[PDB]
Design a protein around this ligand. Structure first.
Ligand SMILES: [Mg+2]
Ligand SMILES: [Mg+2]
Ligand SMILES: [Mg+2]
Ligand SMILES: [Mg+2]
Ligand SMILES: [Mg+2]
Ligand SMILES: [Mg+2]
Ligand SMILES: [Mg+2]
Ligand SMILES: [Mg+2]
Ligand SMILES: [Mg+2]
Ligand SMILES: [Mg+2]
Ligand SMILES: [Mg+2]
Ligand SMILES: [Mg+2]
Ligand SMILES: [Mg+2]
Ligand SMILES: [Mg+2]
Ligand SMILES: [Mg+2]
Ligand SMILES: [Mg+2]
Ligand SMILES: [Mg+2]
Lengths: 117, 150, 140, 56, 110, 103
RNA sequence: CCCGGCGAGGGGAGUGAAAAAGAACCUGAAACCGUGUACGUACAAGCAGUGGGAGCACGCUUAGGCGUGUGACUGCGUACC
RNA sequence: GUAACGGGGCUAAACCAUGCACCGAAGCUGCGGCAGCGACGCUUAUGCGUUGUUGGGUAGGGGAGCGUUCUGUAAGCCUGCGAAGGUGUGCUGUGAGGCAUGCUGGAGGUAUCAGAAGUGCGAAUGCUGACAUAAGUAACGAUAAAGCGGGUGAAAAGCCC
């Protein structure tokens, strides 16, 4: 018959209030933050993460295009050549070869430029 | 509660407000929602469902409780000090255990923090039979057919 | 690992010199906006800080295509009520290629901070290689 | 003179900028090798060199 | 305590006293006055009192006579505030919190 | 020498570098059984023969090391409309380490 | 005992297992208010975060490319009821 | 105040026809994992590995659980070689939460399974208390103003002469 929620009460608040970043103002001191801001964090988080899979892809091809074209054939023609092959088709991402193994990449543009019928 | 008066706070106006009586389950002052009454609690079990499955102890506490001896007749008028002598006959002492001799004699001498309980008579419920380690059935012959009541 | 070349803090800076006196006028802006970011560049990933380093010349040798030599509106309104709006057709402004025409790239850049880092930081001028108050060193 | 949201935190801390106090800077003069207060001379006998207030 | 003096209440509000406090720190000590004696504000007279009392604890609390020291610490904290009613236009506006402070002056080596 | 491969993503950019990946199947535990990858090898792509494709000569795979196949990562991730909140969820993987001898 | 107005208040010394129990006195949270240090920050626009992310302060390890804090710049992007 | 392409800017960066290529969503695929159901392999209470499939969700219906105060099991077990409570940290769970432990703390707490609830707050111009904001801003109550020399005092524009 003793609610005295004060116990769990203090715990619940302290839980969410534990937003290190402190964000700004009431977003830490005041409990108002939680479902107001801490909730937003969870929201902005749910989409941005799995969404980013493309943000980098948009980047990969963005640089992959800026690299492969510098020496004939643009991104549009590139993958098209790479497209033709029995097994030859190592996807992008590592395709950033243009930054480390330049020679390899430029040696990979031939695998497409000369590949294009 | 000590609610001595009807709403005296002017409803409309006075900025923030809105209230009535003061027993008001919201007013820290006092007044508790739907209180709580003495009630009865006491639920009743059928007569048959009562005797059902009780002294199952025998089979279960086989190697423990299911012993039958005597109510210790030679026990002095009112003495518990030497109850131990009689306790060692089974080596079962503070191991709780209840007796069921069915004779409110001087054997009700068992008085302690919580160990041996007499209650040697028809009046007995499983709660006790289970609250102890070795319910010394004893009594002798007392146990019969459907009415082996101890 | 985490494939993504870090932010070299705009470590690369290749100097160049266009001609301005070309035959594409407005079409050129793109090759400039693209350059001032990550066009002929492969590594130095865009989005993050970066850039290049090119430079315009006379520029006074443009005429667009259609009768755009008479339009281009142009009105650099100034928050000052009292009825602003400064309409000045292209040819009317081509008189002094300043924050306009050659500055047609500003509207083509990411805009705001960082993108604004490139902006006019490419120089313009209007006389070709006669008087280069800009850097004389390495160029192409 | 209403006042919607009030940015207590941070704000005002800026107005306080023009509220900091300032330090003085004066001499002690010949006789008093310390006090002299501000562009005065001394208070002990209240004088700049002779009979002023109650000196010698 | 490394020769302190502190306070309690004082009755001049923090913000008030917190202002003059900033005026002194770092060197201080030998500045028991001048940088304090030549700034007339109630808070000033309060910090000086405890300032001297503090620098005084240089002969009783610990050693190191009055001459060196530093006063590496000075800060005022919000002290309990007294409440009072204020008769106004029928009594709508009336809170009045006297407010108080301290000083907690400190002096040590450099 | 560089190399490459897929499996739950073409995570094989780095040469050897011992980087996390997917998980075995029946149960992780360390040790190993010497599971050579496949000729998805970027031809090793390292030497005078950095071949355009993995399709350069037959049989060429790296041996998995199985450094550590455990751990998690924890990430709240919770949605909420205006009338509710599925706020309460968690789904993770362990990701095996592997060092990979050499191409 | 000492500063002080034979103030207030406090600093020692002593009581005590403790005074980080001093009478406002058990434990003493939250709001709210300060001093200190690390980093960001005075040409930049908006629910202030989320994703990416350099640098800097310390911690790393017989490098091994990581830990904590802070976060320039940048894609998104109008609180809760 | 451009404001009747989103802006730039476009003579084709417009349109019409034709064809290929590329970008592009939480859609589909790949990889791993969670749960329900049918099956598959089995083993064969049971259950687990494979597989097909289902898993947006207001009102609302159904099903599982966490936690708190009190009762039994409890003079049992944990504790002054430091309990409850406060704070940090690490590990753990799908989540409610759980545990271990640093510091504080100065005395109590309770695995377990079961029982009963004053059983869980962010809002009701909610009730009580504490503390902000505006802000060191307005104001200091009749516009019959006061100046000076002494005294006292730590200090006097205001007190005494
Ligand atoms: Mg592009
Ligand atoms: Mg009435
Ligand atoms: Mg109101
Ligand atoms: Mg009551
Ligand atoms: Mg009956
Ligand atoms: Mg944009
Ligand atoms: Mg206390
Ligand atoms: Mg700056
Ligand atoms: Mg991130
Ligand atoms: Mg495609
Ligand atoms: Mg996608
Ligand atoms: Mg559902
Ligand atoms: Mg309790
Ligand atoms: Mg609600
Ligand atoms: Mg104002
Ligand atoms: Mg004013
Ligand atoms: Mg008056």
């Amino acid at each position: 018959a003793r609610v005295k929620r004060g116990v769990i009460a203090r715990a619940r608040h302290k839980k969410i209030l534990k937003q290190a970043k402190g964000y700004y103002g009431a977003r830490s001191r005041v409990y108002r933050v939680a479902f107001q801001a801490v909730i937003k964090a969870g929201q902005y988080a749910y989409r941005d993460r799995r969404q980013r899979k493309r943000q980098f892809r948009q980047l990969w091809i963005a640089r992959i295009n800026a690299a492969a074209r510098q020496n004939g054939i643009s991104y549009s023609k590139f993958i098209n050549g790479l497209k033709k092959a029995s097994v030859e088709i190592d996807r992008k991402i590592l395709a950033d070869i243009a930054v480390f193994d330049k020679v390899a990449f430029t040696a990979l543009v031939e695998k497409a430029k000369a590949a294009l019928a | 509660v000590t609610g001595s008066g009807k709403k005296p706070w002017r409803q409309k106006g006075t900025g923030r407000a809105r209230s009535g009586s003061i027993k008001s389950p919201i007013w820290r002052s006092g007044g508790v929602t739907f209180a709580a009454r003495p009630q009865d609690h006491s639920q009743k079990v059928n007569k048959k469902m009562y005797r059902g499955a009780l002294k199952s102890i025998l089979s279960e506490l086989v190697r423990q409780d299911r012993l039958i001896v005597v109510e210790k007749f030679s026990v002095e008028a009112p003495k518990t000090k030497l109850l131990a002598q009689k306790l060692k006959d089974m080596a079962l002492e503070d191991v709780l255990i209840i007796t069921g001799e069915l004779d409110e004699n001087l054997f009700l001498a068992a008085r302690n923090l919580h160990k041996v309980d007499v209650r040697d008579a028809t009046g007995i419920d499983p709660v006790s039979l289970i609250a102890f380690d070795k319910v010394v059935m004893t009594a002798d012959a007392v146990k019969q057919v459907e009415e082996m009541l101890a | 690992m985490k494939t993504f070349t870090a932010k070299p803090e705009t470590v690369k800076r290749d100097w160049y010199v266009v001609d301005a006196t070309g035959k594409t006028l407005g079409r050129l802006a793109t090759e400039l906006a693209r350059r001032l970011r990550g066009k002929h560049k492969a590594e130095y990933t865009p989005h993050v800080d970066t850039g290049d380093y090119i430079i315009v010349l006379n520029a006074d040798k443009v005429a667009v295509t259609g009768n755009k030599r008479t339009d281009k509106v142009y009105y650099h309104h100034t928050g000052h009520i009292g009825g602003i709006k400064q309409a000045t057709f292209e040819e009317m402004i081509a008189r002094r290629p300043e924050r306009v025409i050659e500055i047609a790239v500003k509207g083509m850049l990411p805009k705001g901070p960082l993108g604004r880092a490139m902006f006019r930081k490419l120089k313009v001028y209007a006389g070709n290689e006669h008087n280069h108050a800009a850097q004389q060193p390495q160029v192409l | 003179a209403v006042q919607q949201n009030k940015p207590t935190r941070s704000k005002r801390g800026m107005r306080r900028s023009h509220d900091a106090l300032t330090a003085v800077t004066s001499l002690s003069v010949d006789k008093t090798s310390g006090e002299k207060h501000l562009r005065h001379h001394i208070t002990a006998d209240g004088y700049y060199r002779g009979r002023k207030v109650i000196a010698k | 305590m490394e020769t302190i003096a502190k306070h309690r209440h004082a009755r001049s509000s923090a913000q008030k006293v917190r202002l003059v406090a900033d005026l002194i720190r770092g060197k201080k000590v030998s500045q028991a006055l001048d940088i304090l004696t030549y700034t007339n504000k109630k808070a000033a007279v309060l910090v000086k009192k405890v300032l001297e009392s503090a620098i005084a604890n240089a002969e009783h609390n610990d050693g190191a006579d009055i001459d060196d020291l530093k006063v590496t610490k000075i800060f005022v904290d919000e002290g309990p505030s007294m409440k009072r009613i204020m008769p106004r236009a029928k009594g709508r506006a009336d809170r009045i919190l006297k407010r108080t402070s301290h000083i907690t002056v400190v002096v040590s080596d450099r | 020498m560089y190399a490459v491969f897929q499996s739950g993503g073409k995570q094989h950019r780095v040469s050897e570098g011992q980087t996390v990946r997917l998980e075995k199947l029946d149960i992780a535990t360390g040790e190993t059984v010497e599971f050579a990858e496949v000729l998805m090898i970027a031809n090793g792509e390292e030497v005078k023969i950095g071949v355009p494709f993995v399709d350069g000569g037959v049989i060429k795979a790296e041996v998995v090391a199985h450094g550590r196949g455990e751990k998690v990562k924890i990430v709240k991730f919770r949605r909420r409309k205006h009338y509710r909140k599925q706020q309460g969820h968690r789904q993770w993987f362990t990701d095996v380490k592997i060092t990979g001898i050499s191409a």
